[PDB]
């Protein structure tokens, strides 16, 4: 039961001053809401592309490479 896609929320009880307690938030639901709900969106299929990461030691400035704006060169 730990593979659910729903968010995890904790309540907060107060047994006394400085002695809080936490419990899992769980509200009863009707079967109509669960059965009638829509399904999540199907992601696209797996595929692969290609491009040139470097030509003769220099990185081309193409959309597929990172921008020069944003550790790659010794300075000793």
């Amino acid at each position: 039961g730990y593979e659910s896609t729903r968010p995890l929320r904790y309540g907060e009880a107060s047994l006394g001053p400085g002695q809080p307690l936490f419990y899992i938030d769980d509200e009863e639901v009707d079967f109509e809401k669960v059965i009638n709900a829509p399904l999540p969106k199907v992601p696209r299929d797996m595929t692969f592309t290609a491009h040139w990461l470097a030509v003769e030691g220099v990185q081309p400035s193409i959309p597929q490479n990172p921008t020069t704006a944003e550790d790659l060169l010794p300075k000793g």
Binding site: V55, E56, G57, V58, Q59, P60, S61, I62
Partner: protein, 131 residues
């Protein structure tokens, strides 16, 4: 320009000299681009104001050979040469300097790849794609 044509003819009376043919082309160019200039006079403001107030050998041989060989040619080819001559000369001069005396000079700038050149190539490729 008129006397330039006469002076060139007079000094070298040899008609068949390609130099006069060059002058003939230069004369043709003069006729082509002359009309742009209006016949304006440099009138000093005082003169205009005063008027208003009153109112108020081998190289030469090769050049000649090419000039004769120009009889068969194409205008677009000449335009291409005119466009690309400066860059071609620069690149050729650099290349000639690199391999002086058929020896790899160890002082000329090294041949390296740069990002700006590839950016220029990408711009040209996009221009080609637009076609």
């Amino acid at each position: 320009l008129n006397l330039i044509w006469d002076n060139c003819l007079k000094y070298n009376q040899d008609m068949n000299h390609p130099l006069r043919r060059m002058a003939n082309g230069m004369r043709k160019e003069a006729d082509k681009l002359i009309p742009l200039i209006p016949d304006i006079t440099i009138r000093s403001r005082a003169e205009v104001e005063a008027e208003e107030r009153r109112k108020q050998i081998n190289g030469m041989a090769l050049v000649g050979e090419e000039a004769a060989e120009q009889t068969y040619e194409d205008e677009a080819y000449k335009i291409w040469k005119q466009v690309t001559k400066k860059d071609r000369a620069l690149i050729a001069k650099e290349r000639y300097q690199l391999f002086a005396n058929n020896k790899l000079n160890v002082e000329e700038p090294a041949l390296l790849r740069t990002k700006a050149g590839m950016r220029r190539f990408l711009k040209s490729r996009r221009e080609a794609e637009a076609l």
